[PDB]
Amino acid sequence: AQLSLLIMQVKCLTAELSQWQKKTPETIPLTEDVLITLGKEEFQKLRQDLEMVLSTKESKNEKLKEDLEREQRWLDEQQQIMESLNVLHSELKNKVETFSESRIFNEL
Amino acid sequence: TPLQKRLESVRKQSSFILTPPRRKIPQCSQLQEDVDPQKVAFLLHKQWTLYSLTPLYKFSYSNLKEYSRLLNAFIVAEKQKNIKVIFSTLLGMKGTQRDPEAFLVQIVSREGKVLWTGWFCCVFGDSLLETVSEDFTCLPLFLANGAESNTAIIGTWFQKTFDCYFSPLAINAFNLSWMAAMWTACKMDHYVATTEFLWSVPCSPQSLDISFAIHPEDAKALWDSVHKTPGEVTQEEVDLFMDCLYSHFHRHFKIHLSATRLVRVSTSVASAHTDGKIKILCHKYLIGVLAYLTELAIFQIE
Amino acid sequence: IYFKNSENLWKTALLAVKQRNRGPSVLNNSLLLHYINCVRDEPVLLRFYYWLSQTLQEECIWYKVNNYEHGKEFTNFLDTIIRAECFLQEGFYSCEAFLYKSLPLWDGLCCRSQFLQLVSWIPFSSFSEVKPLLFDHLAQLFFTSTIYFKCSVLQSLKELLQNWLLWLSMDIHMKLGGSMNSVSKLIHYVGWLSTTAMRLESNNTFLLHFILDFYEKVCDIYINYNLPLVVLFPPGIFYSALLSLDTSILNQLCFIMHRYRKNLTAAKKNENFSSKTYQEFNHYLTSMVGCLHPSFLSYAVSFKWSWYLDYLFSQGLQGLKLFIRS
Amino acid sequence: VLRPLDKLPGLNTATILLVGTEDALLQQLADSMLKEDCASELKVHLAKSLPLPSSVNRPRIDLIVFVVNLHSKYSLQNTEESLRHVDASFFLGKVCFLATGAGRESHCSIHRHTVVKLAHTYQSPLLYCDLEVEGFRATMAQRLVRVLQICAGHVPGVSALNLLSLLR
Amino acid sequence: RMTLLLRLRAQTKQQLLEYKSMVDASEEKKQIEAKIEDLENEIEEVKVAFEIKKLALDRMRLSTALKKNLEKISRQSSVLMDNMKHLLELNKLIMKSQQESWDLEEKLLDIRKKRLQLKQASESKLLEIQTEKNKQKIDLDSMENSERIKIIRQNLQMEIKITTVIQHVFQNLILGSKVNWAEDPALKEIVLQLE
Amino acid sequence: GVLAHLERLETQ
DNA sequence: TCGAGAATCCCGGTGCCGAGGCCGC
DNA sequence: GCGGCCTCGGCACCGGGATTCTCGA
């Protein structure tokens, strides 16, 4: 049925796109109301999410300030291990690299 | 290649691209090289509780005495919280030459009363070898049989020293039906035990269990009814064998066995449970039964 | 037992002595996490992958027996995983491997806060090998769950966008096109995700706020990450927030498109984008700059054109400031 | 044989018809799907097999979720048998494949690929869950009820036909 | 009720949409790799056919809800406006809550960029340290020639093992006897024997 | 985070 | 052909780890 | 009536009795 369903899918998307293009925006029958019923409903829903989105965007900068402190601390511990590893690379360069086998036997 | 190969493997596995593994009927595995006849024969008719074992970091098949002492001194210390531990490479429990040699872990108590007899094997598990680095000696299968307390102690020791982790391998009833089908498809003679399928219906108040034990030769003749392509058993052939069982049980007792789940499939080749206490190895097909079991352990690890 | 001392009687004098001196396997190790952060070595990222896979499997099978009390250590362990990835900054290769395994089985709210922060740290794969495996399920639950899970995905994919664009910025630093096509397709698929989520919830302002929060990080691709990936709005969000009904979403869109103007101008300096992207942005401009109105009407009711401006502007409309100055 | 548009719709009635051999779990899912006081009438229907004994006055059925209990191969042999009595114009958007028992992964008589292959070869969404536990039911119930308002047309932007274009 | 009749209009303008789509599909009477391709080029083309349709619906809805609300300035007190003043307050509690956000996120972003620059840099540098330790591993193959290193190592191990025996019988002979151990300047350097 | 928060407006 | 010996199918009679109870803080 | 304590008991793996069936009186 996979192919028998793909063919009907393309046949149905064709009908739906030919019917959406038939759908002119029908704003003529829009609403007999003065739309205060829909207005003061939509602002009230706005009041329902605006408190509900300030409560989320306040936690957003809460976690962003907490993470700014945390990642500043991480960056500090990273530049420390960066300068430390760089100075270890420079020091381990031509200090332990200048190691002879016979000199290692003489140290023994 | 060292990790990204495993990531691509994980992608392939999670993709679930047309899985039905047409499997070769477990071929008579003539005992390869050494395979200590006394040891292997002791290892056959023992009810191994399967586990999935992640690859062991920094393991070597030379330092067996050091690990033996390190674990013996740990087990008897868990008694402080009489026992000898003998790591023993099995030398032949491997599918291909490149697989890691299977090695044992036996809690020998005075005499050779082997309390626990652990067993890590990696046979035909080259879907894990080619994805893990050289430092890890990967043995996906772990085999307990000793008390669960000692297994949950040696597993902790292995986690502590090797960074290997034991998930208890649970063969789902799908894989259980698969192995129940390829084991009545084998070419054996003198069937040791009847082909029993311990079903367990999902009733909420009660827990009725069914033992659909077939005569082993009668199930072979029933398998030949649904066996058409030789050499390899398909998912449809396995399902038709299982549905011939269903249509011989719902025919008789009017209860749809297909609405139940397999919990144990005893066969002349090898018994196999679900909850872990799975692999009894009646016959010497254990390199094929273990091949399936390791392939299933890869599924859990990977 | 464990350093339980008996010098407490002496610790009258010894507490005076303290006052006298005053006067006269690796996740729970932050000091060691820096090591694994710096070694992308084979036997350690694999010694660690196998622990994470078998901890996110065993302790997640632990859900199937409690699902209530085990749902607090798993949450607090996934929090440690999340923190370790935020520090170490690459997605653990068991974090995705557990996600593809446990996303299809996943519900909407079972450790949502942790699972949808794991998605953020997913090793950029192709968006052709990660889309069917994961994003085809972060749409299977995106379109069936409530707004409170919907906003938690375009936020999850918002952070995923940054965690992919970081690893692409230094892919410019450490010396593209086929990597380019991946973030572009991720953003379009979110841009496909975020036009139909706009339709499920009847243009809910909360959800489109998070949509723009995602797009607040799509305007600044060139300026921030040095990536030439200016991807404009799909109109199903652009005009849906243009003709929206609040300004905390209107000025949000205005900030995004101003950063879009800035990023396109910056891309014109260094250099398809030009033809169709500039056409679409001039479409989003002429239509909107002629349109720059309902939430502004709310302000005007609460309220000489320049004075109206000042009343605006002064009252927090900063995205409008950045546009109007541009 | 069920058809999507054989009956006329109501007003806010979104009639989903659960399909699964086990019926206590279907009853639990229906209870959880009506536990939340949604904005739509929710005349949930239950069943065992799609022949659906021919009783007129059955409303315009807006969703058939084939609850395939992965623990039991019967739930697939009774779904695949019941999948042949669904109209081909019904499989487009108004068909979901619930796979209860997934995630437990130890009782699964059915490999979850097989339900994946079944739900892909019929071109319909496949929503895993574990219906036995209310914690994964009271969130799958709010997924089936928002798919419901999509197929029943209650969200005035998305058809059932638009739905499968999202869950492919 | 009007809201309920509105939910009906909407629901029926979509149920008849589905009905007309199906009857048009019934009115009408292959390359599966492209059968999903000429399935995709509508799910993008119906998408541009109805996102513009919904976008025209929304613009004509907001234009009327603006003109209707343009009549709202002309009306009386409208306690709605008392609720909108607090929405201005909420906007201030969000657009200022975003004022940090385009700044806090900017700081976190260049913090993340610096951190990842030092992470790839540290991985390169620490890989250099590890390959230099590997170079010291070739220096390790410089001892396992074992022509005179092995014998001296063995006689060092067989002598320090006497020097860790005679030593610990000084920690046990200048302890058990009549030691007067540390009130003596000879033993004080011989007791407290360095390991 | 806003994910840990978005899990407590789902409840509340 | 038949009578004792060995092996092994059928189910014990045993071994041994979770569950329930129970006594200070 | 709880804290670390302890004691029955389902499940299950290993040890002889009677049925198979081969060989001697």
Short mmCIF file of N, CA and C in Angstrom, two decimals, chain B residues 2-4 6-8 10-16 52 54-55 57 128 131-133 135-136 159 162-163 165-168 299-302, chain C residues 25 40-55 57-58 92-94 96-98 100-101 122-123 125 129-130 133 137:
data_model
loop_
_atom_site.label_atom_id
_atom_site.label_comp_id
_atom_site.label_asym_id
_atom_site.label_seq_id
_atom_site.Cartn_x
_atom_site.Cartn_y
_atom_site.Cartn_z
N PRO B 2 38.41 6.26 15.05
CA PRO B 2 38.50 5.73 16.42
C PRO B 2 37.24 5.89 17.25
N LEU B 3 36.49 6.97 17.07
CA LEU B 3 35.18 7.12 17.70
C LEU B 3 34.10 7.32 16.65
N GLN B 4 34.34 8.21 15.69
CA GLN B 4 33.34 8.59 14.70
C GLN B 4 32.83 7.37 13.94
N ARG B 6 32.25 4.55 15.44
CA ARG B 6 31.22 4.07 16.35
C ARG B 6 29.99 4.96 16.29
N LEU B 7 30.17 6.27 16.11
CA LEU B 7 29.02 7.16 15.95
C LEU B 7 28.23 6.82 14.69
N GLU B 8 28.92 6.51 13.59
CA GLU B 8 28.23 6.09 12.38
C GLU B 8 27.55 4.75 12.57
N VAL B 10 26.29 3.72 15.42
CA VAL B 10 25.14 4.04 16.24
C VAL B 10 24.03 4.60 15.36
N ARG B 11 24.40 5.49 14.43
CA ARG B 11 23.47 5.98 13.42
C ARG B 11 22.84 4.86 12.60
N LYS B 12 23.65 3.91 12.12
CA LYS B 12 23.10 2.80 11.35
C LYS B 12 22.14 1.97 12.19
N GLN B 13 22.52 1.69 13.44
CA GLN B 13 21.70 0.86 14.31
C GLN B 13 20.38 1.54 14.66
N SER B 14 20.42 2.84 14.95
CA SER B 14 19.23 3.59 15.34
C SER B 14 18.34 3.86 14.13
N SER B 15 18.94 3.88 12.94
CA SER B 15 18.18 4.06 11.71
C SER B 15 17.13 2.97 11.54
N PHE B 16 17.44 1.75 11.98
CA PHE B 16 16.55 0.60 11.86
C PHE B 16 16.17 0.38 10.40
N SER B 52 25.55 -7.93 29.44
CA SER B 52 26.21 -7.19 28.38
C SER B 52 27.39 -6.45 28.99
N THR B 54 30.60 -3.99 28.46
CA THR B 54 31.32 -3.02 27.66
C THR B 54 32.80 -3.39 27.61
N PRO B 55 33.50 -2.95 26.57
CA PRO B 55 34.91 -3.33 26.42
C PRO B 55 35.75 -2.95 27.63
N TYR B 57 38.89 -1.65 29.45
CA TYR B 57 40.05 -0.80 29.23
C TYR B 57 41.28 -1.42 29.86
N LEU B 128 31.95 -4.97 16.81
CA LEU B 128 32.48 -4.19 17.93
C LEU B 128 33.99 -4.05 17.84
N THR B 131 35.26 -1.20 15.62
CA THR B 131 34.85 0.12 16.05
C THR B 131 35.53 0.60 17.32
N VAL B 132 36.20 -0.29 18.05
CA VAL B 132 36.86 0.08 19.29
C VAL B 132 38.37 0.08 19.05
N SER B 133 39.08 0.88 19.84
CA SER B 133 40.52 1.04 19.67
C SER B 133 41.24 -0.23 20.15
N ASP B 135 43.45 -0.52 22.75
CA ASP B 135 43.59 -0.66 24.19
C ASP B 135 42.47 -1.47 24.83
N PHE B 136 41.26 -1.40 24.29
CA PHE B 136 40.14 -2.14 24.84
C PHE B 136 40.13 -3.55 24.26
N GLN B 159 34.15 -3.09 37.10
CA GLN B 159 33.93 -1.67 36.89
C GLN B 159 35.05 -0.84 37.49
N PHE B 162 38.62 -1.96 35.34
CA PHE B 162 38.68 -2.03 33.89
C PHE B 162 37.75 -1.06 33.18
N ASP B 163 36.91 -0.33 33.91
CA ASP B 163 35.88 0.54 33.32
C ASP B 163 35.01 -0.23 32.33
N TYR B 165 31.17 -2.18 32.10
CA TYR B 165 29.89 -2.08 32.79
C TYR B 165 28.96 -3.18 32.33
N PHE B 166 28.24 -3.75 33.28
CA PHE B 166 27.47 -4.97 33.09
C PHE B 166 25.99 -4.62 33.00
N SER B 167 25.50 -4.44 31.79
CA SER B 167 24.04 -4.41 31.86
C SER B 167 23.49 -5.82 31.74
N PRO B 168 22.57 -6.22 32.62
CA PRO B 168 22.00 -7.58 32.53
C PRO B 168 21.31 -7.77 31.19
N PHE B 299 23.95 -5.29 20.32
CA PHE B 299 22.73 -4.49 20.25
C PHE B 299 22.54 -3.67 21.52
N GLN B 300 22.82 -4.27 22.68
CA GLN B 300 22.68 -3.55 23.93
C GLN B 300 23.82 -2.56 24.15
N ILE B 301 25.05 -2.94 23.82
CA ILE B 301 26.18 -2.03 23.99
C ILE B 301 26.11 -0.90 22.98
N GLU B 302 25.83 -1.22 21.72
CA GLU B 302 25.90 -0.25 20.64
C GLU B 302 24.51 0.24 20.25
N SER C 25 32.63 8.65 35.19
CA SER C 25 33.76 8.43 36.08
C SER C 25 34.46 9.74 36.41
N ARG C 40 41.21 15.27 23.28
CA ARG C 40 40.30 14.58 22.38
C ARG C 40 40.93 13.26 21.95
N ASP C 41 41.36 12.50 22.95
CA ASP C 41 42.09 11.27 22.73
C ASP C 41 41.13 10.10 22.59
N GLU C 42 41.63 9.02 22.00
CA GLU C 42 40.77 7.91 21.62
C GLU C 42 40.37 7.05 22.83
N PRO C 43 41.31 6.54 23.63
CA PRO C 43 40.93 5.63 24.71
C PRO C 43 40.34 6.30 25.94
N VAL C 44 40.21 7.63 25.96
CA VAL C 44 39.56 8.31 27.07
C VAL C 44 38.16 8.78 26.71
N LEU C 45 37.94 9.28 25.50
CA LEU C 45 36.60 9.56 25.02
C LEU C 45 35.82 8.29 24.72
N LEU C 46 36.49 7.14 24.71
CA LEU C 46 35.82 5.85 24.64
C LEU C 46 35.69 5.17 26.00
N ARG C 47 36.67 5.32 26.88
CA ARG C 47 36.48 4.95 28.28
C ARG C 47 35.33 5.71 28.91
N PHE C 48 35.04 6.91 28.41
CA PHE C 48 33.96 7.73 28.93
C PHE C 48 32.65 7.54 28.18
N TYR C 49 32.70 7.25 26.88
CA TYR C 49 31.47 6.98 26.14
C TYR C 49 30.75 5.76 26.69
N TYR C 50 31.49 4.69 26.95
CA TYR C 50 30.90 3.45 27.44
C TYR C 50 30.33 3.59 28.84
N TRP C 51 30.85 4.49 29.66
CA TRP C 51 30.22 4.73 30.94
C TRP C 51 28.93 5.51 30.80
N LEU C 52 28.91 6.51 29.92
CA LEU C 52 27.70 7.31 29.76
C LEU C 52 26.58 6.50 29.12
N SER C 53 26.90 5.65 28.15
CA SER C 53 25.86 4.85 27.53
C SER C 53 25.25 3.86 28.52
N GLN C 54 26.06 3.26 29.38
CA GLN C 54 25.57 2.28 30.34
C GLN C 54 25.06 2.90 31.63
N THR C 55 25.26 4.20 31.82
CA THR C 55 24.59 4.92 32.89
C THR C 55 23.27 5.53 32.44
N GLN C 57 21.50 4.10 30.18
CA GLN C 57 20.63 2.97 29.89
C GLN C 57 20.13 2.30 31.17
N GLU C 58 21.05 1.88 32.04
CA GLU C 58 20.65 1.22 33.28
C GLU C 58 19.79 2.14 34.14
N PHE C 92 28.69 15.11 24.24
CA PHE C 92 29.20 13.77 24.50
C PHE C 92 28.62 12.80 23.49
N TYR C 93 29.47 11.93 22.96
CA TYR C 93 29.04 11.03 21.90
C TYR C 93 28.09 9.95 22.40
N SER C 94 27.90 9.83 23.71
CA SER C 94 26.81 9.05 24.27
C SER C 94 25.57 9.88 24.51
N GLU C 96 24.21 12.12 22.30
CA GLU C 96 23.40 11.91 21.12
C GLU C 96 22.99 10.45 20.96
N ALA C 97 23.94 9.52 21.13
CA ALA C 97 23.64 8.11 20.97
C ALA C 97 22.55 7.63 21.91
N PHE C 98 22.45 8.22 23.10
CA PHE C 98 21.30 7.98 23.95
C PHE C 98 20.06 8.71 23.46
N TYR C 100 19.16 9.51 20.16
CA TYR C 100 18.51 8.80 19.06
C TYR C 100 17.83 7.53 19.55
N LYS C 101 18.40 6.89 20.57
CA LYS C 101 17.83 5.66 21.10
C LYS C 101 16.57 5.93 21.92
N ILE C 122 24.62 18.25 20.38
CA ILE C 122 24.63 17.05 19.50
C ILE C 122 25.69 17.29 18.42
N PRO C 123 26.81 16.55 18.41
CA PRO C 123 27.85 16.72 17.39
C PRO C 123 27.25 16.97 16.00
N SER C 125 26.09 16.74 12.65
CA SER C 125 26.35 15.52 11.90
C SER C 125 26.27 15.75 10.40
N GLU C 129 21.84 13.10 8.19
CA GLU C 129 21.92 11.88 8.98
C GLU C 129 21.39 12.07 10.39
N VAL C 130 21.29 13.31 10.87
CA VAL C 130 20.70 13.59 12.17
C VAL C 130 19.23 14.00 12.06
N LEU C 133 16.94 10.81 12.13
CA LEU C 133 17.13 10.07 13.37
C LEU C 133 16.58 10.82 14.58
N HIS C 137 11.74 13.17 15.10
CA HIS C 137 11.03 12.95 16.34
C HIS C 137 10.86 14.21 17.16
#
